């Protein structure tokens, strides 16, 4: 705290409680006792624990009818109206597309949509496969996930 | 019909003005004006102006018949005090509270 380190009033003889600093934490303007530092909140996840969790959640995406596998899911030109009509055709409201090879037109046709997300088979994470209602995998994406996890 | 007059931020202590405001509560207003005329306090001068202003606000705004009016509700509240410094002996500083009042007179014929 910005301020001087001198004693405000001498140790014995005033009617006041004894103090030693204007920067004391029990004084106004000059507090925090256990002030925060910038810190890293990252936890360690074991490799086998991360993969066992992904296998468990993706098994529940299978068994709760939350997984769709198609041959190919793409778009001819990068416009979001085409993918809006396309996802309204397939009865998909809140959807996570996951594709084997990373696509550009599909990344631009769903960048504006918040209900829709588009990931690679490499870029899967545990909290998004639980967050979205349906998960539409490509068959190449199923092959790559089955390789990456086994 | 009630008719209110106030002196807000009157430069007198509330304790001093309550001693004069307790003279004229419940009285008729013609008698209360003479009570305040022949009372030798400064608060009588302060509260007589409020009473006369309540009479006039009754007469001009809605009112009736000055013979009818009574002083039914008179009260003094404490206002924002001023903080001053008073030097004393041996380098000690006292504070002076310069206490203000709010004087409220409600006049009503019924």
């Amino acid at each position: 705290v910005t301020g001087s380190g001198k004693k405000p009033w001498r140790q014995k003889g005033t009617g006041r409680a004894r103090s030693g600093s204007i920067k004391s934490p029990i004084w106004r303007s000059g507090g925090v006792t256990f002030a925060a530092r910038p810190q890293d909140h990252s936890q360690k996840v074991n490799k086998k624990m991360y993969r066992g969790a992904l296998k468990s959640i993706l098994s529940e995406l299978v068994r709760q009818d939350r997984l769709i596998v198609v041959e190919k899911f793409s778009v001819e030109a990068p416009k979001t109206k085409l993918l809006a009509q396309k996802l309204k055709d397939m009865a998909l409201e809140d959807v996570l597309i996951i594709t084997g090879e990373l696509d550009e037109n599909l990344f631009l046709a769903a960048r504006n949509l918040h209900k829709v997300d588009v990931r690679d088979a490499t870029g899967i994470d545990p909290v998004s496969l639980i967050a979205f209602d349906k998960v539409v995998m490509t068959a190449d994406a199923v092959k790559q996930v089955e390789e990456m996890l086994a | 019909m009630e008719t209110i007059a106030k002196h807000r931020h009157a430069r007198s202590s509330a304790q001093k003005v309550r001693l004069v405001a307790d003279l004229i509560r419940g009285k008729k207003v013609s008698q209360a004006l003479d009570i305040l005329t022949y009372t030798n306090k400064k608060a009588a001068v302060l509260v007589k102006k409020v009473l006369e202003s309540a009479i006039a606000n009754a007469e001009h705004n809605d009112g009736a018949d000055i013979d009818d009016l009574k002083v039914t509700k008179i009260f003094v509240d404490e206002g924002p005090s001023m903080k001053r410094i008073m030097p004393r002996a041996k380098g000690r500083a006292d504070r002076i509270l310069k206490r203000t009042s709010h004087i409220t007179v409600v006049v009503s014929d019924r």
Partner: peptide, 22 residues
């Protein structure tokens, strides 16, 4: 402030004068 006032304390009252500035 600084006037002292006791025979010998750090700060008491006392009408004397060598002990006493609060």
């Amino acid at each position: 402030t600084c006037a002292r006032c006791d025979s010998x304390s750090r700060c008491g009252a006392x009408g004397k004068x060598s002990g006493x500035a609060s």
